[PDB]
Design a binder for this molecule. Structure first.
Ligand SMILES: C[C@@H]1O[C@H](O)[C@@H](O)[C@H](O)[C@@H]1O
Ligand SMILES: [Ca+2]
Length: 141
């Protein structure tokens, strides 16, 4: 629930994703565990979807600052590439979007500067690539 003294508002929130494979249910990206080894149980996994995506629902409009996305680490790390992070309001209107080409480390940090949003979606832009996320943390600043 807190990471380095900052309240992670995504923790334990409802999640969905495009499909599930390998029992990589979407709630694994909000289970409080940054472990990126798939075999740990901490990491989501969709099927090879058109495209694969994952989303957290904050349950109401909230304010979104830092969003930190933790990649799978044990294998297939390149899958988390060429992707959008999209904020939606209560009526699923897009209110902000950032594109990430790839990760040089195990995570990427994005600052949405306190934009009002209820949903944060991670969407791969390449057809037929599974989406796996170790953790998605969201902070209000
Ligand atoms: C859980 C599995 O891990 C393996 O390393 C991959 O080759 C499979 O595609 C799948 O992601
Ligand atoms: Ca996790």
């Amino acid at each position: 629930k807190f990471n380095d003294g900052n309240l992670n508002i995504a923790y334990a929130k409802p999640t969905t994703q495009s499909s599930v494979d390998y029992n990589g249910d979407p709630n694994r990206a909000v289970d409080g565990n940054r472990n990126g080894n798939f075999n740990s149980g901490s990491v989501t996994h969709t099927r090879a979807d058109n495209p694969s995506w994952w989303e957290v629902d904050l349950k109401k409009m909230d304010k979104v600052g830092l969003v930190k996305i933790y990649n799978r680490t044990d294998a297939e790390t390149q899958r988390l590439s060429n992707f959008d992070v999209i904020l939606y309001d209560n009526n699923r209107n897009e209110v902000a979007k950032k594109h990430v080409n790839n990760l040089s480390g195990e995570s990427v940090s994005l600052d949405f500067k306190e934009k009002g949003a209820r949903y944060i979606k991670v969407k791969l832009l390449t057809s037929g690539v599974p989406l796996s996320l170790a953790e998605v943390e969201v902070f209000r600043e």
